[PDB]
Amino acid sequence: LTQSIYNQKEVTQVNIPSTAGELGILANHVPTIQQLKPGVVEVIETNGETKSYFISGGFATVQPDSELSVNSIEAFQAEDKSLTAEAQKNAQSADEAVAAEAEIELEVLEALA
Amino acid sequence: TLREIEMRLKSIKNIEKITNTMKIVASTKLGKAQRAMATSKVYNEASEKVFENSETAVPENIEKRLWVVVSSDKGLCGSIHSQLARTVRRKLLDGEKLIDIVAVGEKIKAQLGRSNPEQMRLSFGGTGKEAPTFEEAAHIADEILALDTQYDDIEIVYNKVLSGISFEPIMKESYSAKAIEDAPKFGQYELEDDVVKNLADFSLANTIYAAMAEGHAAEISARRNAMDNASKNASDMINKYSILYNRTRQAVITNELVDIITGASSL
Amino acid sequence: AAQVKAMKQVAGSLKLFLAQYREVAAFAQFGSDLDASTKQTLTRGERLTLLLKQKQASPMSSEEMVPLIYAGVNGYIDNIPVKQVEKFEAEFVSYLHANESDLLKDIAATGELSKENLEKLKSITENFVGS
Amino acid sequence: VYVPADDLTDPAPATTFAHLDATTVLSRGISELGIYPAVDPLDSKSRLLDIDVVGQEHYDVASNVQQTLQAYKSLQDIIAILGMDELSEQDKLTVERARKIQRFLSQPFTVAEVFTGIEGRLVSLKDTVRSFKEILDGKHDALPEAAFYMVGGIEEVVAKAEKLAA
Amino acid sequence: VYVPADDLTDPAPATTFAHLDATTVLSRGISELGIYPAVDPLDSKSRLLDIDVVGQEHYDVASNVQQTLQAYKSLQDIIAILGMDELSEQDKLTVERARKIQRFLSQPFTVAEVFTGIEGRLVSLKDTVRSFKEILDGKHDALPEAAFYMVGGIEEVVAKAEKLAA
C-alpha cells in the first residue's frame, strides 16, 4: 500500500468488512477470499490491545499458513466535512453524463467514523 | 584555434558541474525508490506470490501473446531502453510472429514503433516525470481491457535490480481469468461464488505498479553509471583541453613576441 | 587583525558560510530532490548575498552594518522573500536609529561588543516580525 | 611531405597543397588506433573524384562513405561522454557501419609483412567499390568490427568470418 | 616555487623542477581538517623514496600510508554522504585507520610555544617509522582520534591515552 504497517510474524485477531458481510478471520481459517467494502476495520493485538484501520477496497488472501494478508489503498489510524456535505449533495444531483462516479464516493463515507 | 578553447573549456568545465551534481541526487532517489518499491513488493506479492502457489501458468493452448513494456520517458539512464528492445526481440524470432505490445512512455514509443509499428495501436507518453503513483496505473491498465479482451497469456517485461549494480532483462507473467480458474490445485480456496474476473484485473493493475517501481529503480541505479562515467570521461577531457590551452598560450606569447622582435630588430 | 572588533564575530561565520555555499547554490535550482540540511544553506545564503547589495555612492557606516550581519548568521531573514529583503534592509537601519541611537553611538565610538550589547539586538528582532 | 609538429597551418605544408593534384593526408591519431595506412578519409582529396572521370557509380559510393565517416566523428563528443547508448536509433546504426568502414579502410601493405606478419594485399579499384556497397547496405551488417581489420575486400572478411563462425 | 598561470609546462617552473630533488606541498584544505602543519600527504613527493636510498623498511610503510589516504579520498564520496555503515569490515577499518593515520600526521612545532602554548615535540626518524607500524598493524585501534591528534612519537600516544581515559 501507500503505507506499510504489518509484518507476517505472529498470528493476531482481525475483522474484515467483506462484500458477503463483515466477517472474522482467526488462526487456521479457511482460505475464504472475496472483495471487501469501504468500512471500518478492527484490529486487536494480544491481551486485548485496541487498534483500528480503514479500507477502501481490495481482497484478503488467505493460505493454510495461519497468517492473514490484506491489501488496500488507504491504511491509516481512525484518528487520522462541510466540503463532503456539498460533494454528497453534488453526487445526489447528476445529469445524463455517467452518474456512477457520484454514488460510489458516498459509499466510502457510510462509515463516517 | 585559440578563441574557442577557453569557450570549449567553460562548457566542459561546467558540464562537470552537472554530471557530478546528478550522482548524489540520484542517491537520494534510491532511498525514495526502495520505499516506493517496498510500496509494491510487499503489497502485491500477497495477491500473487501466494497466488502463484496455485500455479495457473502456461496455458497449453496456442493463442495471441501480449507483452507490456515498462519504462519512463526520462533519458540519461544508461542502456535501459536499449537492452529492453533486444529482450523483447530475442524471444520474438525464437513468440514467433504473433505478438502485441503496449508501450509505456515517450522513449519506448520510438524504440518499438520504428521496429514493430503494427504490433501496437495505443501507447501514452508522459509516464516518468516523477515517482509514478497508483492513479496512473488504472489509467493504462483499464485501457488494456478497453481495447479488446483477446489474450489469455499476458506477460509483463520489466527490469530487476539488485544492489544497484546493473539492470536485469527478464519476462514476468501475469495470469489470466481463464488460466486463473483452470488451476490443478485451486480447490483449497473457498471464494463464495463471487466474481473471479476481478481477481485478474486487481493483480494485473498491481503488476504494472510493481513493474513501474522496480524498473523505476533500475533507471536510477543505472543513471548514476551513465552520470559517473560522464564525470570521469569529462575529467579525462578537461585535462587534455587544459594542457592544450597552456600549449596555445605558450604559442601565442612566442609567435607574437617573435613578430615584435622581427619588426623591432629590423632596423 | 585589521577588521573591526565588532565585525570579527558577526562576519567571521559569514566568510565560511559562503564557502560551502558556492557549489550548493548552483545545482539546487533544477530539482527539488534536495535535503532540508543542504537546501537550508541556500535559503540563508540567497539573502546574505542579497544583503550585500548596495546602491551607488551609498556607503553605510560600521555602526549600521553590524546589526544586519548578526541577523544573517542567526538566520532571522529566511522567511522574508528575495523581493522584500532589500526593503527589509531599507527600514531596519532607520528604525534602530530612532529606537537605540545610544547603541549606534557606542559602537561608532568603541567598536567593542560585550555579552550585554548582543542581547540588546534580541529585542530589536522581535519588533520587525510584525512588519 | 613532412609536417612540422602536426601543424598543417605551418607555412611549409600550406604552400605545398596548391602544387598537388591529389593529396593523401596521414593522421597521427588514426595511427594510434592501429589503422594502417593512417589515411585520413576526411582530409585526403583528389581531382579525379568527379563523375567525368570515374562516373556516377564510383562517385556515389565515395560520397556515401565520406558522409557516414563524418556523421560518426561529428558526434564523437556525445560518444566519449554520455556513451554510445545515449544516441538515437539511426545515429547508433550509422556508428556501427562507420566503425566497420573505418577499419575496413585499413589494409595490409606488401612491405607490412615485417611489422604485422600478414601477407601483402593488393585490392583492385572496382573490387573495392562494390565491397563498400555491401557494407553500406543491409548486407554483412551482422559481422563485427574485428572482421574488417587488416583485410583486403569482403572476400577475405568472410574468410575471417569463416574462422569466426567456428 | 610559484607557477605562472598554473602552467607546469611554463619555462620558469619546468627549468626549476629539474634541479629539485623533493617537493613539500602545503594544502589549505588539510588545515581545515585540523591538521597542523597542513602538509598535503598525497601530493608531496620526493626522489629519495627508494629502496636503494632509504631501504625496504622505510619504503613499505611510506607507500602504505598514502594508499590508504588515497583509499580514504576515494571512499570520501560515501563517508560524507552514505555514512560509515555501507562499507566492508576491512573497508570500515581502512577508513578507520585512515582517520588514525591522518590525525597522527599532525605534529606540534617547537617554535609555537608563544602562539599556541602547546609544548613542542621533536620526533626522530627511526622512532617515527616504528610508530606507524604500531598504528597500522591493528594495534590499539580502539582509542579515539584525540589520542593521535597533535602527538609526537608512540611512547607519548599511549601515555596521552592514560590521561584521556579519565
Side-chain angles (χ1 to χ4, degrees), chain A residues 7-50:
Chain A
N7 264 268
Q8 61 173 24
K9 294 184 178 181
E10 191 244 359
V11 190
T12 183
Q13 297 181 338
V14 174
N15 287 332
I16 50 172
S18 166
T19 190
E22 183 265 355
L23 304 183
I25 293 184
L26 303 179
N28 198 336
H29 188 278
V30 160
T32 311
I33 50 172
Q34 68 278 354
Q35 58 185 17
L36 302 171
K37 195 184 181 302
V40 295
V41 180
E42 183 176 3
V43 175
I44 298 182
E45 280 193 75
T46 179
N47 295 328
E49 290 292 339
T50 61

Short mmCIF file of all heavy atoms in Angstrom, two decimals, chain A residues 7-50:
data_model
loop_
_atom_site.label_atom_id
_atom_site.label_comp_id
_atom_site.label_asym_id
_atom_site.label_seq_id
_atom_site.Cartn_x
_atom_site.Cartn_y
_atom_site.Cartn_z
N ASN A 7 3.87 -6.70 9.56
CA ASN A 7 4.66 -7.85 9.15
C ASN A 7 3.80 -9.11 9.19
O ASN A 7 2.62 -9.08 9.57
CB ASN A 7 5.89 -8.00 10.05
CG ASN A 7 7.13 -7.35 9.45
OD1 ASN A 7 7.90 -8.00 8.75
ND2 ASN A 7 7.33 -6.07 9.75
N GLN A 8 4.39 -10.24 8.81
CA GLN A 8 3.69 -11.52 8.80
C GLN A 8 4.22 -12.48 9.87
O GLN A 8 4.20 -13.70 9.69
CB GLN A 8 3.79 -12.17 7.41
CG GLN A 8 5.21 -12.47 6.97
CD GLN A 8 5.26 -13.25 5.67
OE1 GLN A 8 4.32 -13.20 4.87
NE2 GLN A 8 6.35 -13.97 5.45
N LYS A 9 4.68 -11.93 10.99
CA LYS A 9 5.35 -12.74 12.01
C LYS A 9 4.37 -13.61 12.80
O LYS A 9 4.38 -14.84 12.65
CB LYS A 9 6.14 -11.84 12.96
CG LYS A 9 7.32 -11.13 12.32
CD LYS A 9 8.12 -10.34 13.34
CE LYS A 9 9.32 -9.67 12.70
NZ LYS A 9 10.13 -8.91 13.69
N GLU A 10 3.53 -12.99 13.62
CA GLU A 10 2.73 -13.71 14.60
C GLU A 10 1.24 -13.62 14.26
O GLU A 10 0.78 -12.64 13.67
CB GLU A 10 2.98 -13.16 16.01
CG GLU A 10 2.39 -14.00 17.13
CD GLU A 10 1.33 -13.25 17.91
OE1 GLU A 10 1.06 -12.07 17.58
OE2 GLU A 10 0.76 -13.83 18.86
N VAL A 11 0.50 -14.66 14.65
CA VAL A 11 -0.94 -14.70 14.42
C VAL A 11 -1.64 -13.72 15.35
O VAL A 11 -1.36 -13.68 16.56
CB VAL A 11 -1.47 -16.13 14.63
CG1 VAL A 11 -2.91 -16.24 14.15
CG2 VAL A 11 -0.57 -17.14 13.93
N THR A 12 -2.55 -12.93 14.80
CA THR A 12 -3.30 -11.93 15.55
C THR A 12 -4.78 -12.04 15.22
O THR A 12 -5.20 -12.84 14.38
CB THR A 12 -2.77 -10.52 15.27
OG1 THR A 12 -3.48 -9.57 16.07
CG2 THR A 12 -2.95 -10.17 13.80
N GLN A 13 -5.59 -11.22 15.90
CA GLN A 13 -7.04 -11.22 15.74
C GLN A 13 -7.47 -9.99 14.95
O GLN A 13 -7.14 -8.86 15.32
CB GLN A 13 -7.73 -11.24 17.10
CG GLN A 13 -7.45 -12.49 17.93
CD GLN A 13 -8.17 -12.49 19.26
OE1 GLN A 13 -8.56 -11.44 19.77
NE2 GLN A 13 -8.36 -13.67 19.83
N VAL A 14 -8.21 -10.22 13.86
CA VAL A 14 -8.58 -9.16 12.92
C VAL A 14 -9.99 -9.44 12.39
O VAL A 14 -10.39 -10.59 12.23
CB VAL A 14 -7.56 -9.07 11.75
CG1 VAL A 14 -8.02 -8.08 10.69
CG2 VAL A 14 -6.17 -8.68 12.25
N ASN A 15 -10.74 -8.37 12.14
CA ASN A 15 -12.04 -8.43 11.49
C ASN A 15 -11.96 -7.77 10.11
O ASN A 15 -11.14 -6.88 9.88
CB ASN A 15 -13.12 -7.73 12.32
CG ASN A 15 -13.50 -8.52 13.55
OD1 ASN A 15 -13.41 -9.75 13.57
ND2 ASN A 15 -13.95 -7.82 14.59
N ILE A 16 -12.82 -8.22 9.20
CA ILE A 16 -12.80 -7.70 7.83
C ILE A 16 -14.21 -7.34 7.37
O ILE A 16 -15.15 -8.12 7.56
CB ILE A 16 -12.17 -8.72 6.86
CG1 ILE A 16 -12.78 -10.11 7.03
CG2 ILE A 16 -10.66 -8.76 7.04
CD1 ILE A 16 -12.33 -11.11 5.99
N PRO A 17 -14.40 -6.17 6.76
CA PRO A 17 -15.72 -5.81 6.22
C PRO A 17 -15.90 -6.26 4.77
O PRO A 17 -15.64 -5.49 3.84
CB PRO A 17 -15.76 -4.29 6.37
CG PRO A 17 -14.32 -3.89 6.20
CD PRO A 17 -13.48 -5.01 6.76
N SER A 18 -16.35 -7.49 4.57
CA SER A 18 -16.42 -8.07 3.24
C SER A 18 -17.71 -7.68 2.52
O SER A 18 -18.63 -7.09 3.11
CB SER A 18 -16.31 -9.59 3.31
OG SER A 18 -16.69 -10.19 2.09
N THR A 19 -17.77 -8.01 1.23
CA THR A 19 -19.00 -7.82 0.46
C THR A 19 -20.05 -8.88 0.79
O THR A 19 -21.24 -8.63 0.59
CB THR A 19 -18.70 -7.84 -1.04
OG1 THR A 19 -19.86 -7.42 -1.77
CG2 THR A 19 -18.30 -9.23 -1.50
N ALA A 20 -19.63 -10.04 1.29
CA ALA A 20 -20.53 -11.04 1.84
C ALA A 20 -20.83 -10.79 3.31
O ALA A 20 -21.18 -11.73 4.03
CB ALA A 20 -19.95 -12.44 1.64
N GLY A 21 -20.68 -9.55 3.76
CA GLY A 21 -20.89 -9.19 5.15
C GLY A 21 -19.59 -9.16 5.94
O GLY A 21 -18.59 -9.79 5.59
N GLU A 22 -19.61 -8.38 7.02
CA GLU A 22 -18.44 -8.26 7.88
C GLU A 22 -18.15 -9.60 8.56
O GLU A 22 -19.03 -10.18 9.20
CB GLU A 22 -18.66 -7.16 8.92
CG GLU A 22 -17.47 -6.91 9.84
CD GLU A 22 -17.56 -7.66 11.15
OE1 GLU A 22 -18.60 -8.31 11.39
OE2 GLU A 22 -16.59 -7.61 11.93
N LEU A 23 -16.92 -10.08 8.42
CA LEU A 23 -16.56 -11.40 8.92
C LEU A 23 -15.48 -11.33 9.99
O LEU A 23 -15.29 -10.29 10.63
CB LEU A 23 -16.09 -12.29 7.77
CG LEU A 23 -17.04 -12.48 6.59
CD1 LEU A 23 -16.45 -13.45 5.57
CD2 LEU A 23 -18.40 -12.97 7.07
N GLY A 24 -14.77 -12.44 10.19
CA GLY A 24 -13.69 -12.52 11.15
C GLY A 24 -12.79 -13.70 10.88
O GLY A 24 -13.26 -14.83 10.74
N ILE A 25 -11.48 -13.46 10.81
CA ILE A 25 -10.50 -14.48 10.45
C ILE A 25 -9.57 -14.68 11.63
O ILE A 25 -8.84 -13.76 12.02
CB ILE A 25 -9.72 -14.09 9.18
CG1 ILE A 25 -10.65 -14.08 7.97
CG2 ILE A 25 -8.55 -15.03 8.97
CD1 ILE A 25 -9.95 -13.81 6.66
N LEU A 26 -9.57 -15.89 12.18
CA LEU A 26 -8.75 -16.24 13.33
C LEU A 26 -8.06 -17.57 13.10
O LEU A 26 -8.68 -18.53 12.63
CB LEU A 26 -9.59 -16.32 14.62
CG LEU A 26 -10.39 -15.08 15.01
CD1 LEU A 26 -11.18 -15.32 16.29
CD2 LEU A 26 -9.48 -13.88 15.17
N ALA A 27 -6.77 -17.62 13.43
CA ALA A 27 -5.96 -18.84 13.36
C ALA A 27 -6.03 -19.51 12.00
O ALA A 27 -6.02 -18.84 10.96
CB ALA A 27 -6.38 -19.81 14.46
N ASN A 28 -6.12 -20.84 11.99
CA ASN A 28 -6.14 -21.61 10.75
C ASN A 28 -7.48 -21.48 10.04
O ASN A 28 -8.20 -22.47 9.86
CB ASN A 28 -5.83 -23.09 11.04
CG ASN A 28 -5.40 -23.85 9.81
OD1 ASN A 28 -5.72 -23.48 8.68
ND2 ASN A 28 -4.67 -24.94 10.01
N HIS A 29 -7.82 -20.27 9.63
CA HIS A 29 -9.08 -20.03 8.93
C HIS A 29 -9.02 -20.58 7.51
O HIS A 29 -7.95 -20.67 6.90
CB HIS A 29 -9.38 -18.53 8.91
CG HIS A 29 -10.75 -18.19 8.39
ND1 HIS A 29 -11.04 -18.11 7.05
CD2 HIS A 29 -11.90 -17.91 9.04
CE1 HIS A 29 -12.31 -17.80 6.89
NE2 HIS A 29 -12.86 -17.67 8.09
N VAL A 30 -10.18 -20.94 6.99
CA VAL A 30 -10.27 -21.48 5.63
C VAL A 30 -9.87 -20.40 4.64
O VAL A 30 -10.26 -19.23 4.82
CB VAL A 30 -11.68 -22.00 5.36
CG1 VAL A 30 -11.94 -22.12 3.86
CG2 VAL A 30 -11.87 -23.35 6.00
N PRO A 31 -9.11 -20.73 3.59
CA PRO A 31 -8.81 -19.74 2.54
C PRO A 31 -10.06 -19.17 1.88
O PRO A 31 -10.29 -19.38 0.69
CB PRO A 31 -7.98 -20.55 1.54
CG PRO A 31 -7.37 -21.64 2.35
CD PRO A 31 -8.38 -22.00 3.39
N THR A 32 -10.87 -18.44 2.65
CA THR A 32 -12.08 -17.81 2.14
C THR A 32 -11.75 -16.39 1.72
O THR A 32 -11.35 -15.57 2.55
CB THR A 32 -13.18 -17.82 3.20
OG1 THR A 32 -13.30 -19.14 3.76
CG2 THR A 32 -14.51 -17.41 2.60
N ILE A 33 -11.92 -16.09 0.43
CA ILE A 33 -11.48 -14.82 -0.14
C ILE A 33 -12.60 -14.24 -0.99
O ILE A 33 -13.12 -14.91 -1.89
CB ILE A 33 -10.19 -14.97 -0.96
CG1 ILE A 33 -10.31 -16.12 -1.96
CG2 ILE A 33 -9.01 -15.22 -0.04
CD1 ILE A 33 -9.15 -16.21 -2.92
N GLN A 34 -12.98 -13.00 -0.70
CA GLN A 34 -13.85 -12.21 -1.56
C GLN A 34 -13.62 -10.74 -1.23
O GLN A 34 -13.07 -10.40 -0.18
CB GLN A 34 -15.33 -12.60 -1.39
CG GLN A 34 -15.95 -12.24 -0.06
CD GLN A 34 -15.64 -13.25 1.03
OE1 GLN A 34 -15.05 -14.29 0.78
NE2 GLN A 34 -16.06 -12.93 2.25
N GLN A 35 -14.05 -9.88 -2.15
CA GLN A 35 -13.72 -8.46 -2.07
C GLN A 35 -14.33 -7.82 -0.82
O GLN A 35 -15.41 -8.20 -0.36
CB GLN A 35 -14.20 -7.73 -3.32
CG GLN A 35 -15.70 -7.84 -3.58
CD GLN A 35 -16.12 -7.20 -4.88
OE1 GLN A 35 -15.29 -6.94 -5.76
NE2 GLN A 35 -17.41 -6.93 -5.02
N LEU A 36 -13.60 -6.85 -0.27
CA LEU A 36 -14.05 -6.08 0.88
C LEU A 36 -14.68 -4.76 0.42
O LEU A 36 -14.42 -4.27 -0.68
CB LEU A 36 -12.88 -5.79 1.83
CG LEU A 36 -12.09 -6.97 2.41
CD1 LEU A 36 -10.86 -6.47 3.15
CD2 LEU A 36 -12.95 -7.80 3.34
N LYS A 37 -15.51 -4.19 1.30
CA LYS A 37 -16.24 -2.95 1.04
C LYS A 37 -15.70 -1.83 1.93
O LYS A 37 -15.27 -2.09 3.06
CB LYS A 37 -17.74 -3.14 1.30
CG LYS A 37 -18.62 -2.04 0.73
CD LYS A 37 -20.09 -2.21 1.10
CE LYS A 37 -20.94 -1.10 0.48
NZ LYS A 37 -20.48 0.25 0.90
N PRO A 38 -15.69 -0.57 1.44
CA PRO A 38 -15.25 0.54 2.29
C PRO A 38 -16.00 0.65 3.61
O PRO A 38 -17.15 1.09 3.66
CB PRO A 38 -15.51 1.78 1.41
CG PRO A 38 -16.34 1.28 0.25
CD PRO A 38 -15.92 -0.14 0.06
N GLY A 39 -15.34 0.25 4.69
CA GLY A 39 -15.92 0.31 6.02
C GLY A 39 -14.84 0.26 7.08
O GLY A 39 -13.64 0.21 6.77
N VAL A 40 -15.28 0.26 8.33
CA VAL A 40 -14.34 0.23 9.45
C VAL A 40 -13.70 -1.15 9.56
O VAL A 40 -14.29 -2.17 9.19
CB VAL A 40 -15.05 0.62 10.76
CG1 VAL A 40 -15.53 2.06 10.70
CG2 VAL A 40 -16.22 -0.32 11.03
N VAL A 41 -12.47 -1.17 10.06
CA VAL A 41 -11.70 -2.40 10.23
C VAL A 41 -11.13 -2.41 11.64
O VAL A 41 -10.42 -1.48 12.03
CB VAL A 41 -10.57 -2.53 9.19
CG1 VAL A 41 -9.80 -3.82 9.40
CG2 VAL A 41 -11.13 -2.46 7.78
N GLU A 42 -11.44 -3.46 12.40
CA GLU A 42 -11.00 -3.59 13.78
C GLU A 42 -9.84 -4.58 13.87
O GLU A 42 -9.94 -5.71 13.38
CB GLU A 42 -12.15 -4.04 14.68
CG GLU A 42 -11.79 -4.13 16.15
CD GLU A 42 -12.98 -4.49 17.02
OE1 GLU A 42 -14.07 -4.72 16.47
OE2 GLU A 42 -12.82 -4.55 18.26
N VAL A 43 -8.74 -4.14 14.48
CA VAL A 43 -7.55 -4.96 14.67
C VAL A 43 -7.14 -4.87 16.14
O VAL A 43 -7.06 -3.77 16.69
CB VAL A 43 -6.39 -4.51 13.76
CG1 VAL A 43 -5.13 -5.31 14.05
CG2 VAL A 43 -6.79 -4.67 12.29
N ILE A 44 -6.88 -6.02 16.76
CA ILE A 44 -6.59 -6.09 18.18
C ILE A 44 -5.39 -7.01 18.39
O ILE A 44 -5.36 -8.13 17.87
CB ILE A 44 -7.80 -6.60 18.99
CG1 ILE A 44 -8.98 -5.64 18.84
CG2 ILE A 44 -7.44 -6.77 20.46
CD1 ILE A 44 -10.20 -6.05 19.63
N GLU A 45 -4.40 -6.53 19.15
CA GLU A 45 -3.23 -7.32 19.50
C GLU A 45 -3.60 -8.34 20.58
O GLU A 45 -4.75 -8.47 20.98
CB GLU A 45 -2.09 -6.41 19.94
CG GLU A 45 -1.31 -5.76 18.81
CD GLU A 45 -0.01 -5.14 19.30
OE1 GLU A 45 0.94 -5.90 19.58
OE2 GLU A 45 0.06 -3.90 19.41
N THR A 46 -2.60 -9.06 21.08
CA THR A 46 -2.82 -9.98 22.18
C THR A 46 -3.15 -9.21 23.45
O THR A 46 -2.84 -8.03 23.60
CB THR A 46 -1.59 -10.86 22.40
OG1 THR A 46 -1.82 -11.75 23.50
CG2 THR A 46 -0.37 -10.01 22.70
N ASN A 47 -3.83 -9.90 24.38
CA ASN A 47 -4.29 -9.36 25.65
C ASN A 47 -5.30 -8.23 25.49
O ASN A 47 -5.63 -7.55 26.47
CB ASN A 47 -3.12 -8.89 26.53
CG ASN A 47 -2.21 -10.03 26.95
OD1 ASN A 47 -2.67 -11.16 27.14
ND2 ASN A 47 -0.93 -9.74 27.11
N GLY A 48 -5.81 -8.01 24.28
CA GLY A 48 -6.89 -7.07 24.07
C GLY A 48 -6.47 -5.62 23.86
O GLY A 48 -7.16 -4.71 24.33
N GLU A 49 -5.37 -5.39 23.16
CA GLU A 49 -4.92 -4.04 22.86
C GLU A 49 -5.69 -3.50 21.66
O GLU A 49 -5.64 -4.08 20.57
CB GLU A 49 -3.42 -4.01 22.60
CG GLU A 49 -2.57 -4.28 23.84
CD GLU A 49 -2.64 -3.15 24.86
OE1 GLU A 49 -3.00 -2.02 24.47
OE2 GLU A 49 -2.34 -3.40 26.04
N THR A 50 -6.39 -2.38 21.86
CA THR A 50 -7.32 -1.87 20.86
C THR A 50 -6.59 -1.05 19.81
O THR A 50 -5.88 -0.09 20.13
CB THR A 50 -8.40 -1.02 21.54
OG1 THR A 50 -7.79 0.09 22.19
CG2 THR A 50 -9.16 -1.85 22.56
#
